[PDB]
Write a protein that binds this ligand. Structure first.
Ligand SMILES: [Zn+2]
Length: 42
């Protein structure tokens, strides 16, 4: 019962290797990679 490397999705990321059952999630995740507002959290 987790969210990662579990199941096959039509939306995959060739950058971080993340899956997204829904495009919407991927779309927002794509841009999330290029952020120029605030620094990481750590
Ligand atoms: Zn990604």
């Amino acid at each position: 019962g987790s969210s990662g490397s579990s199941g096959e999705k039509p939306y995959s990321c060739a950058e971080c290797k993340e899956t997204f059952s829904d495009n919407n999630r991927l779309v927002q995740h794509q841009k999330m990679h290029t952020v120029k507002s605030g620094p990481s959290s750590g």
